[PDB]
Protein backbone atom coordinates (compact mmCIF):
# COMPACT_ATOMS: atom_id res chain seq x y z
CA UNK A 236 0.00 0.00 0.00
CA UNK A 237 1.23 3.46 -1.00
CA UNK A 238 -0.53 6.75 -0.24
CA UNK A 239 0.31 10.19 -1.63
CA UNK A 240 0.08 13.29 0.56
CA UNK A 241 0.27 16.39 -1.63
CA UNK A 242 0.40 19.89 -0.12
CA UNK A 243 0.10 23.38 -1.57
CA UNK A 244 2.73 25.11 0.63
CA UNK A 245 5.62 23.10 2.08
CA UNK A 246 7.09 26.29 3.60
CA UNK A 247 4.04 26.50 5.90
CA UNK A 248 4.89 24.38 8.98
CA UNK A 249 1.24 23.27 9.22
CA UNK A 250 1.83 21.05 6.19
CA UNK A 251 5.10 19.83 7.61
CA UNK A 252 3.08 18.85 10.70
CA UNK A 253 0.48 17.02 8.60
CA UNK A 254 3.36 15.14 6.94
CA UNK A 255 4.99 14.17 10.23
CA UNK A 256 1.72 12.68 11.50
CA UNK A 257 0.99 11.03 8.14
CA UNK A 258 4.43 9.37 8.54
CA UNK A 259 3.35 8.08 11.96
CA UNK A 260 0.25 6.60 10.28
CA UNK A 261 2.50 4.98 7.64
CA UNK A 262 4.73 3.29 10.22
CA UNK A 263 1.73 2.22 12.33
CA UNK A 264 -0.53 0.86 9.54
CA UNK A 265 2.39 -0.42 7.40
CA UNK A 266 1.93 1.65 4.24
CA UNK A 267 4.44 3.76 2.29
CA UNK A 268 3.93 7.54 2.34
CA UNK A 269 4.93 9.65 -0.65
CA UNK A 270 5.18 13.35 0.27
CA UNK A 271 4.94 15.86 -2.60
CA UNK A 272 4.80 19.66 -2.69
CA UNK A 273 2.57 21.09 -5.40
CA UNK A 274 2.16 24.89 -5.19
CA UNK A 275 0.59 25.21 -8.65
CA UNK A 276 -1.73 23.31 -10.96
CA UNK A 277 1.22 22.32 -13.17
CA UNK A 278 2.92 20.68 -10.14
CA UNK A 279 -0.33 19.01 -8.97
CA UNK A 280 -0.56 17.30 -12.37
CA UNK A 281 3.04 16.10 -12.18
CA UNK A 282 2.54 14.99 -8.56
CA UNK A 283 -0.34 12.73 -9.54
CA UNK A 284 1.69 11.38 -12.50
CA UNK A 285 4.54 10.55 -10.10
CA UNK A 286 2.18 8.83 -7.68
CA UNK A 287 0.76 6.71 -10.52
CA UNK A 288 4.30 5.81 -11.69
CA UNK A 289 5.00 4.66 -8.12
CA UNK A 290 1.73 2.63 -8.04
CA UNK A 291 0.07 4.54 -5.21
CA UNK A 292 -3.52 3.46 -4.50
CA UNK A 293 -4.60 6.74 -2.91
CA UNK A 294 -3.84 10.45 -2.55
CA UNK A 295 -4.72 13.06 0.08
CA UNK A 296 -4.31 16.59 -1.25
CA UNK A 297 -4.51 20.21 -0.17
CA UNK A 298 -4.60 21.76 -3.62
CA UNK A 299 -3.20 25.24 -4.36
CA UNK A 300 -6.37 26.09 -6.32
CA UNK A 301 -9.57 24.32 -5.25
CA UNK A 302 -11.03 24.83 -8.75
CA UNK A 303 -8.55 22.15 -9.97
CA UNK A 304 -11.01 19.63 -8.36
CA UNK A 305 -12.52 18.08 -11.48
CA UNK A 306 -9.15 17.52 -13.19
CA UNK A 307 -7.68 16.04 -10.02
CA UNK A 308 -10.64 13.70 -9.68
CA UNK A 309 -10.48 12.60 -13.30
CA UNK A 310 -6.76 11.81 -13.15
CA UNK A 311 -6.98 9.98 -9.83
CA UNK A 312 -9.78 7.84 -11.30
CA UNK A 313 -7.78 7.11 -14.47
CA UNK A 314 -4.78 6.06 -12.36
CA UNK A 315 -6.74 3.96 -9.84
CA UNK A 316 -6.09 6.25 -6.87
CA UNK A 317 -8.78 6.97 -4.28
CA UNK A 318 -8.98 10.72 -3.67
CA UNK A 319 -9.39 12.65 -0.38
CA UNK A 320 -8.95 16.38 0.34
CA UNK A 321 -7.56 18.08 3.43
CA UNK A 322 -7.85 21.72 4.56
CA UNK A 323 -9.07 23.24 1.31
CA UNK A 324 -12.16 21.58 -0.15
CA UNK A 325 -12.17 20.86 -3.89
CA UNK A 326 -14.98 22.52 -5.91
CA UNK A 327 -16.52 22.49 -9.37
CA UNK A 328 -16.86 25.33 -11.90
CA UNK A 329 -19.73 26.94 -9.97
CA UNK A 330 -17.87 26.72 -6.68
CA UNK A 331 -19.93 23.79 -5.33
CA UNK A 332 -17.98 21.24 -3.25
CA UNK A 333 -17.16 17.90 -4.94
CA UNK A 334 -19.70 15.55 -3.31
CA UNK A 335 -17.69 12.33 -3.90
CA UNK A 336 -14.46 13.55 -2.28
CA UNK A 337 -14.17 12.97 1.46
CA UNK A 338 -12.83 16.09 3.14
CA UNK A 339 -11.30 17.12 6.44
CA UNK A 340 -10.89 20.78 7.34
CA UNK A 341 -11.41 23.17 10.20
CA UNK A 342 -14.72 24.58 11.46
CA UNK A 343 -13.70 27.86 9.89
CA UNK A 344 -16.40 30.28 10.99
CA UNK A 345 -16.27 29.10 14.61
CA UNK A 346 -12.45 29.27 14.56
CA UNK A 347 -12.71 32.82 13.31
CA UNK A 348 -15.08 33.66 16.16
CA UNK A 349 -12.42 32.35 18.55
CA UNK A 350 -9.85 34.62 16.91
CA UNK A 351 -12.05 37.68 17.38
CA UNK A 352 -12.95 36.75 20.95
CA UNK A 353 -9.25 36.32 21.84
CA UNK A 354 -8.45 39.71 20.35
CA UNK A 355 -11.42 41.43 22.10
CA UNK A 356 -10.42 39.96 25.47
CA UNK A 357 -6.82 41.20 25.24
CA UNK A 358 -7.95 44.62 24.04
CA UNK A 359 -10.26 44.80 27.08
CA UNK A 360 -7.45 43.74 29.42
CA UNK A 361 -5.39 46.69 28.05
CA UNK A 362 -8.27 49.15 28.55
CA UNK A 363 -8.56 49.87 24.84
CA UNK A 364 -11.70 51.63 23.66
CA UNK A 365 -12.90 49.12 21.05
CA UNK A 366 -14.91 51.72 19.14
CA UNK A 367 -11.67 53.53 18.22
CA UNK A 368 -9.54 50.53 17.18
CA UNK A 369 -8.47 49.86 13.60
CA UNK A 370 -9.50 46.36 12.46
CA UNK A 371 -7.12 44.98 9.83
CA UNK A 372 -8.78 42.13 7.93
CA UNK A 373 -6.22 40.30 5.79
CA UNK A 374 -8.42 38.91 3.06
CA UNK A 375 -8.17 36.05 0.60
CA UNK A 376 -11.88 35.82 -0.02
CA UNK A 377 -11.60 33.67 -3.16
CA UNK A 378 -11.02 30.64 -0.89
CA UNK A 379 -14.12 29.77 1.18
CA UNK A 380 -12.25 28.54 4.27
CA UNK A 381 -10.20 31.73 4.33
CA UNK A 382 -13.28 33.92 3.88
CA UNK A 383 -15.09 32.09 6.69
CA UNK A 384 -12.15 32.49 9.11
CA UNK A 385 -11.99 36.25 8.60
CA UNK A 386 -15.78 36.70 8.63
CA UNK A 387 -15.95 34.93 12.00
CA UNK A 388 -13.23 37.14 13.42
CA UNK A 389 -14.91 40.32 12.20
CA UNK A 390 -18.32 39.18 13.51
CA UNK A 391 -16.88 38.39 16.94
CA UNK A 392 -15.15 41.79 17.03
CA UNK A 393 -18.30 43.71 16.06
CA UNK A 394 -20.18 41.76 18.79
CA UNK A 395 -17.56 43.06 21.24
CA UNK A 396 -18.02 46.70 20.28
CA UNK A 397 -15.49 47.19 17.50
CA UNK A 398 -16.90 49.49 14.83
CA UNK A 399 -17.94 48.27 11.39
CA UNK A 400 -16.64 51.59 10.01
CA UNK A 401 -13.16 50.74 11.34
CA UNK A 402 -12.88 47.40 9.51
CA UNK A 403 -10.14 47.83 6.91
CA UNK A 404 -10.09 45.19 4.20
CA UNK A 405 -6.55 44.27 3.12
CA UNK A 406 -6.94 41.94 0.11
CA UNK A 407 -3.92 39.72 -0.55
CA UNK A 408 -2.44 38.77 -3.92
CA UNK A 409 -1.23 35.49 -2.38
CA UNK A 410 -2.32 33.86 0.88
CA UNK A 411 1.14 33.85 2.44
CA UNK A 412 3.39 36.08 4.53
CA UNK A 413 4.58 38.08 1.49
CA UNK A 414 1.00 38.71 0.33
CA UNK A 415 -0.09 39.79 3.79
CA UNK A 416 2.98 42.01 4.33
CA UNK A 417 2.22 43.87 1.11
CA UNK A 418 -1.51 44.14 1.70
CA UNK A 419 -1.05 45.36 5.28
CA UNK A 420 1.38 48.10 4.24
CA UNK A 421 -1.15 49.38 1.70
CA UNK A 422 -3.81 49.51 4.42
CA UNK A 423 -1.62 51.18 7.06
CA UNK A 424 -0.68 53.91 4.60
CA UNK A 425 -4.37 54.77 3.99
CA UNK A 426 -5.40 54.62 7.66
CA UNK A 427 -2.79 56.59 9.59
CA UNK A 428 -5.61 57.86 11.87
CA UNK A 429 -5.67 54.76 14.11
CA UNK A 430 -3.43 54.55 17.17
CA UNK A 431 -4.45 51.02 18.11
CA UNK A 432 -4.82 48.10 15.73
CA UNK A 433 -5.94 44.51 15.70
CA UNK A 434 -5.17 42.12 12.88
CA UNK A 435 -5.89 38.63 11.67
CA UNK A 436 -5.92 36.59 8.52
CA UNK A 437 -6.49 33.05 7.41
CA UNK A 438 -3.49 31.61 9.27
CA UNK A 439 -0.36 32.39 11.30
CA UNK A 440 1.68 33.08 8.18
CA UNK A 441 -0.60 35.81 6.86
CA UNK A 442 -1.16 37.25 10.34
CA UNK A 443 2.60 37.58 10.92
CA UNK A 444 2.88 39.46 7.64
CA UNK A 445 0.67 42.20 9.09
CA UNK A 446 2.65 42.21 12.34
CA UNK A 447 5.91 42.71 10.40
CA UNK A 448 4.34 45.44 8.27
CA UNK A 449 3.12 47.24 11.41
CA UNK A 450 6.55 47.07 12.98
CA UNK A 451 8.01 48.79 9.90
CA UNK A 452 5.53 51.65 10.43
CA UNK A 453 5.98 52.21 14.17
CA UNK A 454 3.00 50.05 15.17
CA UNK A 455 4.61 47.74 17.71
CA UNK A 456 3.43 45.36 20.35
CA UNK A 457 1.72 47.90 22.62
CA UNK A 458 -0.45 49.15 19.74
CA UNK A 459 -1.11 45.86 17.90
CA UNK A 460 -3.06 42.73 18.92
CA UNK A 461 -2.84 40.06 16.23
CA UNK A 462 -4.11 36.49 16.51
CA UNK A 463 -3.47 33.77 13.97
CA UNK A 464 -4.72 30.28 13.14
CA UNK A 465 -2.69 27.00 13.28
CA UNK A 466 -0.53 27.27 16.37
CA UNK A 467 2.42 25.69 14.52
CA UNK A 468 5.99 26.93 14.12
CA UNK A 469 5.18 30.43 12.84
CA UNK A 470 3.23 31.08 16.08
CA UNK A 471 5.91 29.41 18.16
CA UNK A 472 8.66 31.54 16.58
CA UNK A 473 6.80 34.69 17.66
CA UNK A 474 6.21 33.30 21.17
CA UNK A 475 9.90 32.45 21.64
CA UNK A 476 11.19 35.96 20.84
CA UNK A 477 12.98 37.60 23.77
CA UNK A 478 10.87 40.74 23.27
CA UNK A 479 7.20 39.95 22.66
CA UNK A 480 5.77 41.07 19.32
CA UNK A 481 2.28 42.11 18.26
CA UNK A 482 1.57 38.47 17.43
CA UNK A 483 -0.35 37.84 20.64
CA UNK A 484 -1.90 34.43 20.12
CA UNK A 485 -3.08 31.73 17.73
CA UNK A 486 -5.89 29.21 17.49
CA UNK A 487 -4.11 25.90 17.91
CA UNK A 488 -5.28 23.28 15.43
CA UNK A 489 -4.70 19.53 15.54
CA UNK A 490 -2.45 18.23 12.73
CA UNK A 491 -2.75 14.69 14.08
CA UNK A 492 -6.37 14.74 12.88
CA UNK A 493 -5.45 16.26 9.49
CA UNK A 494 -2.34 14.09 8.95
CA UNK A 495 -2.78 10.83 10.88
CA UNK A 496 -6.60 10.35 10.82
CA UNK A 497 -6.96 11.28 7.17
CA UNK A 498 -4.20 8.80 6.28
CA UNK A 499 -5.91 6.04 8.29
CA UNK A 500 -9.28 6.84 6.69
CA UNK A 501 -7.57 6.52 3.29
CA UNK A 502 -5.74 3.30 4.30
CA UNK A 503 -8.99 1.67 5.47
CA UNK A 504 -10.77 2.90 2.32
CA UNK A 505 -8.12 1.22 0.13
CA UNK A 506 -7.73 -2.02 2.10
CA UNK A 507 -11.25 -2.73 3.46
CA UNK A 508 -13.41 -0.49 1.23
CA UNK A 509 -14.65 1.37 4.32
CA UNK A 510 -16.69 4.48 3.33
CA UNK A 511 -14.67 7.49 4.51
CA UNK A 512 -16.31 10.23 6.51
CA UNK A 513 -17.47 12.63 3.79
CA UNK A 514 -16.82 15.73 5.92
CA UNK A 515 -15.01 16.26 9.20
CA UNK A 516 -14.61 19.77 10.56
CA UNK A 517 -12.07 20.06 13.35
CA UNK A 518 -11.76 22.44 16.29
CA UNK A 519 -9.17 24.60 17.97
CA UNK A 520 -8.25 26.39 21.17
CA UNK A 521 -6.49 29.65 21.88
CA UNK A 522 -2.78 29.61 22.72
CA UNK A 523 -0.66 32.51 23.86
CA UNK A 524 2.87 32.75 25.31
CA UNK A 525 1.41 31.70 28.70
CA UNK A 526 -0.09 28.33 27.70
CA UNK A 527 1.31 27.26 24.33
CA UNK A 528 3.67 24.59 25.69
CA UNK A 529 1.04 22.97 27.89
CA UNK A 530 -1.73 23.16 25.30
CA UNK A 531 0.40 21.59 22.62
CA UNK A 532 1.67 18.82 24.97
CA UNK A 533 -1.89 17.95 26.02
CA UNK A 534 -2.58 17.18 22.32
CA UNK A 535 0.70 15.23 22.01
CA UNK A 536 2.08 17.75 19.51
Ligand SMILES: OC[C@H]1O[C@@H](O)[C@H](O)[C@@H](O)[C@H]1O
Nearest residue numbers: 247249322323340341438465
Ligand atom coordinates in the same frame (compact mmCIF):
# COMPACT_ATOMS: atom_id res chain seq x y z
O1 LIG B 1 -6.99 23.54 7.62
C1 LIG B 1 -6.00 24.42 8.14
C2 LIG B 1 -5.06 24.89 7.04
O2 LIG B 1 -5.86 25.59 6.10
C3 LIG B 1 -5.12 25.98 4.95
O3 LIG B 1 -5.98 26.65 4.06
C4 LIG B 1 -4.02 26.97 5.34
O4 LIG B 1 -3.26 27.26 4.18
C5 LIG B 1 -3.13 26.31 6.41
O5 LIG B 1 -2.11 27.21 6.87
C6 LIG B 1 -4.00 25.83 7.57
O6 LIG B 1 -4.57 26.92 8.26
